[PDB]
Amino acid sequence: MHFVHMRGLPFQANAQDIINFFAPLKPVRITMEYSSSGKATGEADVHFETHEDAVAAMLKDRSHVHHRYIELFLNSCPKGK
């Protein structure tokens, strides 16, 4: 329903780094991607309680996690409903 896709996270980043990234917005669920070799890709799905929280979270676009800038993509209530 209401999630933000992340791209470009540092390899060493944890779910708590994702939580601090969107703070004070509190994700309800975090999903992290791993490659065929079991290594993190830097991509993650962050689920929010409401559409408004997922929309607010988008202001964090191009902000950083350590040295890496993060690319965000909104997956919440599209205009082609």
Side-chain angles (χ1 to χ4, degrees), residues 6-79:
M6 305 172 88
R7 188 218 241 162
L9 284 153
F11 287 122
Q12 62 272 37
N14 50 49
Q16 188 61 55
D17 284 331
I18 293 172
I19 286 155
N20 306 334
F21 182 78
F22 292 109
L25 297 167
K26 293 266 168 247
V28 305
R29 171 164 146 241
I30 292 161
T31 278
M32 284 176 94
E33 297 186 50
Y34 304 89
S35 72
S36 50
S37 56
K39 289 188 201 183
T41 59
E43 285 190 34
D45 288 337
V46 189
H47 295 258
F48 293 97
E49 188 177 68
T50 60
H51 173 66
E52 290 85 18
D53 280 6
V55 164
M58 286 307 297
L59 292 164
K60 282 286 170 162
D61 195 19
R62 269 79 181 225
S63 275
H64 299 71
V65 183
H66 309 160
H67 57 295
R68 297 283 292 187
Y69 66 80
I70 315 302
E71 290 176 78
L72 306 182
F73 312 84
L74 187 65
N75 290 266
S76 190
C77 310
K79 298 166 185 179

